[PDB]
C-alpha cells in the first residue's frame, strides 16, 4: 500500500503497510475537537440571583415612592447583583465513536505517510537519557530541528532525552493521538510503537 522508510544500521530499508488511501479532513477534525473538548476544565462559574449574598427585603414599597419597582437588590438588573445565564461547572467531555477515533488514528498517520514525513527506526543506537545523546542521533537521521517532530516510542530514556526539546513531542505509543500527530511536521516511531499501532487500528 504505502512504502515506509525504515532507518536501520544496515540502511534505509523500506516497509509497507495498508494505511487508508482516502483522508477525511472532517473526521480528523471531529477527533481533535473531541480531544480538545473533553480536556476542558469546566471551571467557569457565575453566582445566580439566589446564590448572591444579600437579603430579600423589598427595598422600598411597591407604590407611591416615586421611583421604580424593585424587590431584593440581588436582582440581575442591579449592580453587584445576580448574573443571568452566566456559566456554571460543565462536563464539556463527551463520547466520540471509537471507530471514528481508530479511523482518525490511521488517517492521521497515513497523511504524514503521503508526505513521506513518517519515519521508523529499529532502535536509537546510542541514547541513554541525555538530550545531547539524541541530537547527534537525530542529526544522523536527518532530523535537523527545522521541523517539529512527534517521537513515539516506549523506551523511557529516549523520551526523557528529547522531551525538553523545543521541536519534539514525546509519547508512549500507547498514547499516540491525532492532534499530536497533526500538531507536528514529522512523525517517528519504534517498530514496537509501530507494532502496537497496527494492533490498535486493526
Amino acid at each position: 500500500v504505502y512504502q515506509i522508510p525504515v532507518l536501520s544500521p544496515s540502511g534505509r530499508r523500506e516497509l509497507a503497510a495498508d494505511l487508508p488511501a482516502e483522508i477525511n479532513p472532517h473526521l480528523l477534525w471531529e477527533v481533535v475537537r473531541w480531544q480538545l473538548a473533553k480536556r476542558r476544565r469546566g471551571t467557569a462559574s457565575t453566582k445566580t440571583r439566589g446564590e448572591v449574598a444579600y437579603s430579600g427585603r423589598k427595598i422600598w414599597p411597591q407604590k407611591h415612592t416615586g421611583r421604580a419597582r424593585h424587590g431584593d437588590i440581588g436582582a440581575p438588573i442591579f449592580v453587584g447583583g445576580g448574573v443571568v445565564f452566566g456559566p456554571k461547572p460543565r462536563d464539556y467531555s463527551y463520547t466520540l465513536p471509537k471507530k471514528v477515533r481508530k479511523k482518525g488514528l490511521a488517517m492521521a498517520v497515513a497523511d504524514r505517510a503521503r508526505e513521506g514525513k513518517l519515519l521508523l527506526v529499529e532502535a536509537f543506537a546510542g541514547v541513554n537519557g541525555k538530550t545531547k545523546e539524541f541530537l547527534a542521533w537525530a542529526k544522523e537521521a536527518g532530523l535537523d530541528g527545522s521541523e517539529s517532530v512527534l517521537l513515539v516510542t516506549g523506551n523511557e530514556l529516549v523520551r526523557r532525552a528529547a522531551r525538553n526539546l523545543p521541536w519534539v513531542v514525546t509519547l508512549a505509543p500507547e498514547g499516540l493521538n491525532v492532534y499530536d500527530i497533526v500538531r507536528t511536521e514529522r512523525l517517528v516511531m519504534d517498530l514496537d510503537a509501530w507494532e502496537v499501532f497496527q494492533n490498535r487500528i486493526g
Binding site: 483522508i23 479532513p25 472532517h26 480528523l28 477534525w29 481533535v32 492521521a108 497533526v182
Partner: protein, 149 residues
C-alpha cells in the same frame, strides 16, 4: 495535513439564532416572540401537547381500552421473540438462542421462536417454538428442528 487545514465540512457547524440584538438581525425587540400574550410571557404555555384552553382534552375524551394492570404489577410468564428464516441465512450448521443473541438477532431473557418469512436451510435449529409455516419450510429444506423445554 495541518491544524489550519482542519475545517469541518460546510454546514456541519451552523451558527445560532441570537434574538434581541437589534433591528438588523430581524430578531430584535420582541425576540421573534410576538406581542403580549401568555406565549410571549416567561415560562409560557401549558404543555401544548395536551392542554387545549379549558375544554376537555382530545386525549382525556378518548375511551380507555384493555387491562391497565394492577398491584403488585406485571405478571411473569415466559416471553418469545420470533426471528425470520431469511435472517438465519448467514449462519452455517447449528443455530441456538445464544449465538442468535451474540449475533444481534435475539434479545436476552426472551425465548426463541422461528418464523418463516424467508427460505429454510438444511440447518440444525434449536428454539422454543416454530410457526406452522416455518416448520413446513424447515422440514422440507432438509432441516432438523429441535424444540426445547
Amino acid at each position: 495535513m495541518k491544524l489550519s487545514d482542519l475545517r469541518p465540512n460546510p454546514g456541519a457547524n451552523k451558527r445560532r439564532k441570537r434574538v434581541g440584538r437589534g433591528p438588523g438581525s430581524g430578531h430584535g425587540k420582541t425576540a421573534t416572540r410576538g406581542h403580549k400574550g401568555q406565549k410571549s410571557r416567561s415560562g409560557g404555555l401549558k404543555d401544548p401537547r395536551r392542554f387545549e384552553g379549558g375544554r376537555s382534552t382530545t386525549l382525556m375524551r378518548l375511551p380507555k381500552r384493555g387491562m391497565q394492570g394492577q398491584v403488585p404489577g406485571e405478571i411473569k410468564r415466559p416471553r418469545y421473540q420470533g426471528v425470520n428464516l431469511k435472517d438465519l441465512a448467514r449462519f452455517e450448521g447449528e443455530v441456538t438462542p445464544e449465538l442468535l443473541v451474540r449475533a444481534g438477532l435475539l434479545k436476552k431473557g426472551y425465548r426463541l421462536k422461528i418464523l418463516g418469512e424467508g427460505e429454510a436451510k438444511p440447518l440444525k435449529v434449536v428454539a422454543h417454538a416454530f410457526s406452522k409455516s416455518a416448520l413446513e419450510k424447515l422440514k422440507a429444506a432438509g432441516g432438523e428442528p429441535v424444540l426445547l423445554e
